[PDB]
Amino acid sequence: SGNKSVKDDMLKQNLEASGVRVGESLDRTTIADIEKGLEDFYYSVGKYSASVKAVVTPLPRNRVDLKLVFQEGVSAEIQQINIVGNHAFTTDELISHFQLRDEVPWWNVVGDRKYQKQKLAGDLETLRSYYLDRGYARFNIDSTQVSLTPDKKGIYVTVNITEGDQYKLSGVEVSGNLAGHSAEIEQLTKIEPGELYNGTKVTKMEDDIKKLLGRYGYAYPRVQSMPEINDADKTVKLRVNVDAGNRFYVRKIRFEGNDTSKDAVLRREMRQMEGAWLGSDLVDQGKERLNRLGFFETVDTDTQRVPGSPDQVDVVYKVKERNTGCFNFGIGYGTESGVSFQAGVQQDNWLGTGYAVGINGTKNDYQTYAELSVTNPYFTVDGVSLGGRLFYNDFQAYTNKSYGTDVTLGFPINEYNSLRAGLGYVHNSLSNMQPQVAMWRYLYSMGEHPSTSDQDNSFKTDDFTFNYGWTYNKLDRGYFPTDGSRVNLTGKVTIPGSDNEYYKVTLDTATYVPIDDDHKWVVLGRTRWGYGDGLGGKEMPFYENFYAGGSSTVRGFQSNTIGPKAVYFPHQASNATQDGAKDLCKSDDAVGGNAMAVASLEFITPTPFISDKYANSVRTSFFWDMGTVWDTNWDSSQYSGYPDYSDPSNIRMSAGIALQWMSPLGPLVFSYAQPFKKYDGDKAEQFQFNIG
Amino acid sequence: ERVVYRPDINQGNYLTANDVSKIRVGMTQQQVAYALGTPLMSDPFGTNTWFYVFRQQPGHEGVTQQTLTLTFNSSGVLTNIDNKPALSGN
Amino acid sequence: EVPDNPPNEIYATAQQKLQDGNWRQAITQLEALDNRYPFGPYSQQVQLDLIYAYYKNADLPLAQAAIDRFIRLNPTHPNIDYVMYMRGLTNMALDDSALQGFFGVDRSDRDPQHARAAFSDFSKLVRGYPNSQYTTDATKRLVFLKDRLAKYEYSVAEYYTERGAWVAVVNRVEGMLRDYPDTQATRDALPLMENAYRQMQMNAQAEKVAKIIAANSS
Amino acid sequence: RYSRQVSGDEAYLEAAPLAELHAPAGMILPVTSGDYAIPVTNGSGAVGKALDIRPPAQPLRTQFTGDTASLLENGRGNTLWPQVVSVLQAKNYTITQRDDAGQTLTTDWVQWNRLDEDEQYRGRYQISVKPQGYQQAVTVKLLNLEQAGKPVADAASMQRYSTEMMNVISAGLD
């Protein structure tokens, strides 16, 4: 008790080492030594004015329990960091770029002056880089000094240095055993004369030279760089000696960690071929393909040299499996809708077979829905995908009964680029439609000429259509992406023999750009566009109209609550009942238009209370969303007082905070935002919550 | 239906014209290995025969093979040498 | 929580709770008295009971830790064959998902790193102690493991046939021959070898492997 | 039961036997590594769920060499036999058919061991003849046929259990 800043188990190990193992005679003689040893233990952390006391409690059977009372009074604090000897840079400009601090802003609490012996060497390396990168080649440390005040609260640090001089590079004399690659390597080592010498530039140069050599298979070469400094002209030449090793061959590549996904699945996405000359970049391409696949928490590589030969090397991929798609089964019983039924699954990588299978359905008093979908992504070896689905629904409450079937074939072209094409059938039927200007005018455009006096309306259609699509993604992780782009377009076109005739094109894009080197703060830009239009004469059916708001399009509004609002007709047979109105009234409901455009820019920032160790399961963003939707099959001169619903001007806006967590039940998403802009009836649910 | 992209396929030991030029009977296994590197396959049935095959299958435009075979004696001394610049027929 | 009681009754309740079948409080009291008295004569029997308890509850990583500890403290305990057998058994049973066996998909091409280690452990047991109580079961399980590894190897070779990297399939079937020239998988995979040799027109060995296949056709 | 058997999986018993690959004339087979090599041993082992996966009972002079229960250095070794008689009259409340005291040879009757685990009552008779081996007055138990469920089963594992019941109790009190 009393060990605020340390852990009990390490103290237990310390007493274990000192022959004070639990289950031994309590040596009252050694108590002072035990206390003093623990004082020396806190000597390491930095608590020097600490006192430890021992309490001995006898127990039955003549036993003893020990209370170790710890008093960690005050630890060391850095008073000031004092670099001495410099006539180019001010001290503050140098201290600003260390890790240890001597002072922190009064309005901010993000760190302390807790001196650590390890951080000194890193800080000296940092300072050496800071001078030497701007051509202070001769610069070196004279010495370092760490001093303790005889108070055990103040720590003083001094670094004696020598600014040398300001030198600049002259020319490159790279040579050695280039294995017939002098041209590209000399283009890479090239630099115009007169530019000042830079330190880390040479290191990056060497690393990229090694990488380029590796790309042709020289896995383990030796590259060294040596400067020669002319003091007279303030110049420096550099000698780059390279020695390409033997060309390495992959004996075999293995896989670890995949206890549920069959080895074929992992091996299908490999550009480096077992039994061939090693490609230092193809292995990395395979690794990022595995990441992009989307169901591996972490993937890493290790190229172990086999002891039996100087050439054979085994490439080992180690992966950590993650959950992917999960079961559900809900039977909700009540007074309205009675005992409603619902169940289904939605998972890719079915039992590890690599498929993508999703079945779902619900039984309700007035709404029965079912959908089944399967898709094999690598039907052939090359990677064509064969997929299909069926869906059936009937919704009575509005009456709508329909069922549709579709099949798709996809294939890759070049890298990162895939094309899909397929066929679809859909049978649809509507009955007892409520009065609404847009649906009535669409039906007249079809040629039924229905009666607005009463809602006795029946309509039926059978449609055949063709589907096309194009996808391009280069994004580093298949989930929680942190860098790259992801564009997905898809369109459907009717074909002759179909009651409706139209064409619809939808497009989505997500673009991630990282700022910090460690990929922890990210900038996300999301765009989504959509346009559907009748092919000719006819117009695109209302029941395929777009929407907005909701959770996936624009956070802040309820589901599909953005766009033109419908107009009812008040009359006898509506219930717009005869004893409830007389003149045409707009209806607060929302029916989407035929064109939509939305976007959102947001900042991805880590969350606290989760260690970086488990950071990969939580993700917080600050988001700014913009959205709009409108119709083209609209007239305003026909309705002077009724507001226009064809103006691309009512651009709804929102801003707030959002959070995602890959909980052991699925991707749980929470968000709170405010709609800084709104129009008409845009009832907003401030806080949004959903799964997937 | 050859529109689908296909990753480049390689299966060789990367035989280079200079390296096959260095070949001359009368070396031992270590000497020839240092000349060319460890073969990726040898006959496991009855005899010690070293096969250096150099294949390349780019895109949908055919294949390219440089074949080399070496047979030695039971004392590991080079005895017979063979080489085929292309693949018999197709 | 648990009072400091004489080892007598704590071990007595350990035995009778274990005989009952309740295992949570069983391991709890076992670990308690194991921590409390790491000197008593119980220690050997305590740890031999605790390994069985961890195995039965499927706490396999902790079972492996405890079993390594036991092997370390007395490498020549008179009845170590049992603990080695349990090592192999835990290591093998750790390679099951209990859901892909529901649906009947065979896990013969998943990660075969636990199978290899279980094989090594069983082989060590049968080597050292060929006259103990765990011989025939070890032999049967070890045959099963050998066949599973053969199946995995054939799976990888078959995929490389579908892709068309014939050097790799040649090397894989050759490794099959050197390491498992006794299973059905190699007998089925020899045609892949002959196909491979015929592909690069290195047919001179294709007829050799053809005799290899034909000789044991029946 | 989930008490004295391996995990529920049992599909490995029907394992296809290994057919060694013959070598055609004119060529031979490559070298074997031997890392995965199966030896031949004696049979007569319990397999499947039949095998008793239960930790062995270590006695706690504690002879554990099978039936050998000859516990022996105390100079009062004679009185241990009436001290064992205290275990018989009281404790187990068991009795002996021909319990010699001067010869220190007790023929304890067959007991009835039943401690959970769905264990059928076990009838074990021991030869409680007290020797004087390598020490002062020793005591020995030499078991015989043990009935249990079956007429008599004398598996190697169960013999360790049956001797243990007396080994635990006799060391427990005496």
Numbering used by the authors:
A (entry chain A): 100 to 496, 504 to 681, 691 to 807
B (entry chain E): 24 to 113
C (entry chain D): 26 to 243
D (entry chain C): 30 to 89, 96 to 107, 109 to 210
Copied sentences from the primary study:
The outer membrane is a formidable barrier that protects Gram-negative bacteria against environmental threats. Its integrity requires the correct folding and insertion of outer membrane proteins (OMPs) by the membrane-embedded β-barrel assembly machinery (BAM). BamA is composed of a 16-stranded β-barrel, which, in E. coli, is preceded N-terminally by five polypeptide transport associated (POTRA) domains that extend into the periplasm. Unfolded OMPs are delivered to BAM by the periplasmic chaperone SurA, but how SurA and BAM work together to ensure successful OMP delivery and folding remains unclear. The results suggest that SurA binds BAM at its soluble POTRA-1 domain, which may trigger conformational changes in both BAM and SurA that enable transfer of the unfolded OMP to the BAM lateral gate for insertion into the outer membrane.
Complexes of BAM disulphide bonded to SurA-EspP cross-linked via BamA β1 (S425C) and residue S1299C in the C-terminal β-signal of EspP were purified from the E. coli OM, and the structures solved by cryoEM. The structures revealed BamA- EspP- hybrid barrels captured as late stage folding intermediates, as expected. Fully-folded EspP β-barrels that contain the native α-helix in the barrel’s lumen were present in all structures. In these structures, both Extended and Compact conformations of SurA are present, as well as a structure in which SurA was not observed, consistent with the chaperone dissociating from POTRA-1 in these late-stage folding complexes. Collectively, these results suggest that these late-stage folding intermediates of EspP are no longer being chaperoned by SurA. Hence, we term these as ‘Release Complexes’, in which SurA has returned to a structural ensemble that includes both Extended and Compact states. These Release Complexes also support the functional relevance of our previous POTRA-1:SurA disulphide bonded structures, since the interaction between POTRA-1 and SurA is again observed without SurA being covalently tethered to BAM at this position.
